[model samples]
Target: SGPVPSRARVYTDVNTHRPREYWDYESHVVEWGNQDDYQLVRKLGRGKYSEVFEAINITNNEKVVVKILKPVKKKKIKREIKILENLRGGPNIITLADIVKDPVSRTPALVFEHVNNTDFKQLYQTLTDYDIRFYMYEILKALDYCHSMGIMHRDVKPHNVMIDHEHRKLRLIDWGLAEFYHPGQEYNVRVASRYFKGPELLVDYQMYDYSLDMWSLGCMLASMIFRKEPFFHGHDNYDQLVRIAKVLGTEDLYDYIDKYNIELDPRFNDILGRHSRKRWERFVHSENQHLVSPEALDFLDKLLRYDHQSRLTAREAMEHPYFYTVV
Candidate 1:
């Protein structure tokens, strides 16, 4: 007898879920006809707030990354879309191809050009000193471009950088935490990854500027050169501050206190105390010599300036002697 055909699997219907058409490279995919026909592939990864997937455009047979925003408050959704719109395309920045609204999930999905390679975090794990310098140079170049457009990428970390294997290009991704700067506007200091956050962010919750990104960049560069996490990973907010104090020293706390005109949160005070700048400098410089290059060290010193306003801007950092050789 001929082989029997396998029956298609079927399940009982449940009213809990509504029947909806799943669109692939059709009505659901934005810029569908104009750009290329995209086929929904598989999910790449997901975070607390979003999910990314590998997709293929049928027309050109090109792969791309599709980032979909999980169901979020309308205000937040609008803000995210607005930010993405503002940061459309540049060689260094991730390229946004299209935006789609899924009818079934009622979520917004953003299509971006696929950048195949590990991120800086993974790259750092396997890189040498020279490689670290090369990577940091690329990152600074990207940040320089972003800052020129008046966009502050509040979150700068190894994970947000994409290393392209084919072209050996370093592309900056994930601008979800980015914000636009208005002239003479008061900057909000409440942003950025905890480990890479600057002292000003920890001390003052209102100050904002491009320096915050530079501070994070410095921390990232430290991690890359040291072959370990830069700031000690904290168990909680208080723990994070304590970790910062241990490595960077606490002498600047008093200066921070006076400048911000605020009292230290009791938890942080217990772990830190006022000390002289000279003493703190000796401690940090002596203990951290093994992990970074002289150029990197100088950059970090400038980037981590206690006064956020005094921190180096992206353009200034790019022009620094550290990049002179490469640039």
Candidate 2:
């Protein structure tokens, strides 16, 4: 009876009709594959939870990506495996090839289909306006599929999205922070990366739904069009909201919090001063002159709103005029 509850405008009952077996990940046991079949080729990158590497399947002589878990709880590992398993064949969703574990150390690893990926930093530099539209449309396909399937990709930054420009393939990777979305359920505010974290997460609103992913996609799209790596450059979690406030304006943010009965963290008292919303066109520069268009700005505004409920859902965003010609 505190704040009025909100549910996803679309796909609200995705998990309601499912059998418990389908959504109950803790009850599922992983079948470990032969670890000797795959050999590590080189280190790809590292996350707080796993060491990623390029590995080759000696049996078939094909390359695959391996993510070796860093001694995390078995329950957390199963949740990722279950979510990936559930989303296996969805459009642009990363495929889980196999699961393996070391007999001696008992460290579990996940094997996934390899995409000849280029780092987003350099890749975005080479993309044309058309390319951005195409890839972003593909990303929305994945987002829509996951949300429709009752999952939320808590982390939706560029690093988690793999692009193989050679074949024009895109795979949404890294399911570590992804979770099953249950309506009216409270989720952790600490889920997404700081820059992509939405206003709901920043203000400690817990009953967030699938609209969270759209905000992240908005941040990603804004950076690409504006040539800024991270659209919101927040130093810490507190300043992250400050950074967003500086762009979206403090007045609207206050309206948002009030709508949801959200109280600001007392720490915001010092740094959370007033700011007027900056125009989207203000970010345009000669370098990114070609990328900014009327439709692009309109599409971006719809997704970056302070009210999560007001933000466009993934399916709605996919149908925007900015993607009209591309799709």
Candidate 3:
């Protein structure tokens, strides 16, 4: 037990001195401001969890994104508010304006600063080699900061990352699935979206930690670099792991399972097949070769590993040569 098979990394350990109460939100005080203060501009978008709108603050005449929560549990609402308040003002975090409730229906809503963001589908197509490296590097700082605070953003997909291309701004949003990391604790494997879920999640391994976020980030990175909408595009959860194994090789997946002593569900037994590890160079083609490089590939290689513990940390990733200014 040199590295504690369950949770090995420096960040995997929960706050022993602090305990769960330190991160609990059961008694979190609600400000309960005026919900009608925001004049609706237009519907921004909707997620599986909330309806988002672009609105203007009546008093200040400032643009803000109004996120009206769906009929979710009160505890779930409190956790998101608590984490946002806790991580406010950190690098690249989405700014929370206030917590408001609709007086008529008594529904809770969250106000956040507006970001002028383009869809990654149109956005990623235009990025240069320099743009990709720099932006990815910039996001690493945000990840490192959140992990250091002991918060695990269970969701780390591109949709949650707001990129104001005009001003070169990036803001990480959507904390509905985020949670405080308590060591040796089992979490819901059903948290992240299907496309971006890590192997740990797909296989029902619940005691995962901040490294789960890293795995999700890696999934996003793989898609951007490879020019695939989803790098590991699985039709379903079990197929998700199958897709990932096809690229990363089945040997490591088996090894990781054995190392952790994880008992995978029997459903995986029928679909599991051996796959050779695919090289990063093999991902190149004329359409996307301009964005490919030794440094970029190498840095990405450290991220999209089958074993979560084997992946590079956010701080370590930032120091990679892909971001070096040789001048």
Candidate 4:
């Protein structure tokens, strides 16, 4: 990679003029809701930063997910609460029903809308081609809606995308990694999960925008149509970029670095070599070819580009023909 110039996308801050208060979470004061109002039914799952449970809202006996945060800085908690509230009813954004804190330990908890979610590990195996297309379209709505409001779901992956197949519903959860997109800001590259991390993050590009989520979306789509759990498998961060180059090819990677003034890590020098971009068709096998199609391949090509600006926005991807079968 080389030094990045001021080649930011023009829309980097299209909604920037809206007012600081609209995107300022640092000054947000959380109004903690009553923790006792929801009673835990059972432990559902856990994440690196929180313990999760299924609970019932006692006021009306409605089901919800109680995400209890582990000890963390007050600021991170505030950033999440504010972002969720900001996008409260926008498209598929996860609804943050309430915020509560432990009466004793003061640990904060986020009460959220609960979907009867099945693990993607178990569920993707059962989805038909149309099912995959239908759900991916819904996922795009969530991503597009968030981006429109100047937000980025930095962490976009299968685990965070909840699918309630019985209801044909999808909800993008886990806004803990989500943040407002301030133009040209150097964001922490250590944000998204490994398999879903974008090329910009891997090569240490700091001025990434919402297209970062688009890259992760591409990875998820690749895995779905290819029937691979993770289309790119790398053991470490360095190896991650190498794995991506292996598939996306090394030409554009080096070209992108040169154009963006990106000084790639010296480590890329030794392991880097000629690798042609693999065709989408190579991934087709007896089990997964049913999910593969010309439209699906074209959609992946647009979202998986090395240049973030060149990648399709959520709105554009939704219009792609791959989803024409959605009806």
What C-alpha RMSD separates each model from the true structure? Answer: 15.8, 1.2, 2.3, 1.6
Which of candidates 2 and 3 reaches a greater lDDT? 2
What is the C-alpha local distance difference test score of each model? 0.63, 0.91, 0.84, 0.88
Model 2, which residues run further than 4 Å from truth? none
Q: For candidate 4, what is the lDDT?
A: 0.88
Against the true structure, whose TM-score is highest?
Answer: 2
Name the lDDT value of residue 215 in candidate 3. Answer: 82
Over the stretch 38-149, how does candidate 4's per-residue lDDT look in tens digits? 8899999998789999999888999999999898888898888889999999888889989997788777899999989999999999999999999999999999899888
Query: What TM-scores do the predictions have?
Result: 0.78, 0.97, 0.94, 0.96
Pairs that collide in candidate 4 are 1-262, 1-263, 1-264, 2-261, 2-262, 2-263, 3-261
TM match of model 2 to true structure: 0.97
Indicate whether candidate 1 or candidate 2 has the larger lDDT. 2
- Model 2, span 191-309: residue lDDT tens: 99999999889889899999999999999999999999899999988999999999999999988888888878998867879999999999999999798899999999999998999
lDDT of 1 by residue, 10-120 (tens): 111111132222211122213322323567789878855788989987777788987877776655545555555555676478887777666555566778888886755
In model 3, what lDDT does residue 55 have? 94
Clashing pairs in 3: none
- 144 in model 4: Cα distance from truth in Å? 0.5
